[model samples]
Target: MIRTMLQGKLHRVKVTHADLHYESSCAIDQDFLDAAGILENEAIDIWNVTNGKRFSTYAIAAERGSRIISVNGAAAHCASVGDIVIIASFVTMPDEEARTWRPNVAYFEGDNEMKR
Candidate 1:
């Protein structure tokens, strides 16, 4: 049997910018995306901590090594600069594998820098 599980997560990441004019989706730092194993254009859910908003959007790559997290399009209404948020992705796996699977969690400090 298959079961859904958390695949990766970026916790307490602060939003560095927001653009309502842009098309859509969240632009994340390439480093963060890599660390969290979130692929470009991959669907992820974001929860705004500062304003109690939640939305689903796809991930896009920002500058590599840049400490930037931007919300674009309609999602911008839900998140703003300096707002703390959580980004998460999920996957499906066999029930047996799900029991042993541990999701990759990236914790951010300051301006979205991964906690070492």
Candidate 2:
């Protein structure tokens, strides 16, 4: 969700084309951020912007981190460093894309106990 949230921020940043990228190390964090809907607005600070790729079916999360509570599940030593995980932020340059555009914003709001 952090990636998506960052995408939303890019829309707010009014950029032409900016996206978010992550490695397997941060997948769990992205999942939680996505679920918590933190990306729809400027909740957390913007970290960085980068490229895109894909995730293998076998690479999906098996569970949440047992102890950390606010992070992703373990990688079990099967993760890779060269693999790429990117989010394509725009269709064109910022000035060109902004002529008529808006961020795809979705609000995540509810009672604290409702998500589980």
Specify the highest-lDDT model's number.
1
lDDT of 2 at 55: 23
Candidate 1 per-residue lDDT over residues 1-116, each given as its tens digit: 99989989999998998999997999999999988899998999999989999889999999998878999998899988989999999999999999999998899777576898
Estimate every model's Cα lDDT from 0 to 1: 0.91, 0.26
| lDDT score, candidate 2, position 98 | 58
Distance (Å) between predicted and true CA of 5, model 1? 0.5
User: What are the runs in model 1 whose C-alpha is more than 4 Å off?
Assistant: none
Candidate 2 lDDT by residue in tens digits, 1-116: 11221233111111111113322233222343344333322223322222232222111221342111111123212223322222222223455545555543322222111123
lDDT of 1: 0.91
Structural RMSD, model 1: 0.8
TM-score of 1: 0.96
